Amino acid sequence: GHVQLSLPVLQVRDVLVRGFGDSVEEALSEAREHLKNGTCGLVELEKGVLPQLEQPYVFIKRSDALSTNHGHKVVELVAEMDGIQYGRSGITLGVLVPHVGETPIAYRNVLLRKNG
């Protein structure tokens, strides 16, 4: 189940603007909406990445809400200020950014929770 969705994958060094906003719930909402528009892209979480983003790093984690093994890499939209949790984990599949033409190197599919 869930909706299937794709995004581009951009370099954090081309993505001049990696903030959707400057609070958690802001960036989470705007992310959901830049996804709804389709003007979002993905940035992979690597060791030097957080202290180049703004702050409310809109993460994707592989849906810790289930107990089954048989599926695609499903994820869900989440956000943290210091990246206290999630970003500093191995769940976590990247951080979203507003796509402004930064030239992708790749694309990253996921599914997207839709209750009804």
Number of domains in the chain: 1
Q: How far is residue 65's CA from residue 105's CA, in Å, rounded to a whole number?
A: 31
Contacting residues for 78 by C-beta, under 8 A, at least 6 apart: 28, 58, 59, 60, 61, 86
Give the technique used to solve this structure. Answer: NMR
Residue 54 structural domain: 1-116
Q: How far is residue 9's CA from residue 109's CA, in Å, rounded to a whole number?
A: 10
Nearest to 63 by CA among 7, 3, 9: 3
Q: How far is residue 31's CA from residue 59's CA, in Å, rounded to a whole number?
A: 10
Structure tokens belonging to residue 10 = 């951009």
